[PDB]
Design a protein around this ligand. Structure first.
Ligand SMILES: C[C@@H](Oc1cc(-c2cnn(C3CCNCC3)c2)cnc1N)c1c(Cl)ccc(F)c1Cl
Ligand SMILES: [Zn+2]
Ligand SMILES: [Zn+2]
Ligand SMILES: [Zn+2]
Length: 162
């Protein structure tokens, strides 16, 4: 099957808010906010819930800017990653036990300290281009293949449990 995930980028005109994973899986890397969508909540609920827990921020709105599929050789469960961005935050960013938010100038993004697929789709998100992406991995993050398309509009999946 697949597992449903959200990824949220807080993107203001000249800077982006990323979070460093503090402990555990993927520790020491910077990424957007998000996580697994739980049963009982919609995709948008999960994205809002993760951003609140990981950064302490509330959002007025989330823009659907991308979809990514992660596939790992051996695992029959793909990752269905719904990607959102937003520039209408409320509150002050404050770390959780899991993530610490920090602002980054758009021309100083630390790609070497982020997940490898970010080097592909993150520049498209930075240029306000919507995208559909697929990445096949082996191991933690070794890309075997990928395809990345710019889209006019992000296609809806019509998840009826989320
Ligand atoms: C923050 C982000 O980091 C990534 C994790 C992964 C990832 C997560 N898990 N794995 C595998 C590690 C071992 N093999 C099974 C999963 C790779 C791939 N690309 C990423 N950008 C991430 C994570 Cl950590 C989890 C779910 C997501 F939808 C996203 Cl977008
Ligand atoms: Zn479900
Ligand atoms: Zn946006
Ligand atoms: Zn989906």
């Amino acid at each position: 099957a697949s597992r449903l995930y959200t990824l949220v980028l807080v993107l203001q005109p000249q800077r982006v808010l990323l979070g460093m994973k503090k402990r555990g899986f993927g520790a020491g890397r910077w990424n957007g906010f998000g996580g697994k969508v739980q049963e009982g909540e919609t995709i948008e609920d999960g994205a809002r819930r993760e951003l609140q827990e990981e950064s302490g921020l509330t959002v007025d709105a989330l823009h659907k800017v991308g979809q990514i599929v992660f596939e790992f050789v051996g695992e029959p469960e793909l990752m269905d990653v719904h990607v959102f961005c937003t520039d209408s935050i409320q509150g002050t960013p404050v770390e959780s036990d899991e993530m610490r938010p920090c602002w980054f100038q758009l021309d100083q993004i630390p790609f070497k300290d982020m997940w490898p697929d970010d080097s592909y789709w993150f520049p498209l998100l930075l240029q306000k281009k919507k995208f559909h992406g697929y990445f096949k991995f082996q191991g933690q993050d070794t890309i075997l293949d990928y395809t990345l398309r710019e889209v006019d509009t992000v296609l809806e999946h019509h998840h009826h449990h989320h």
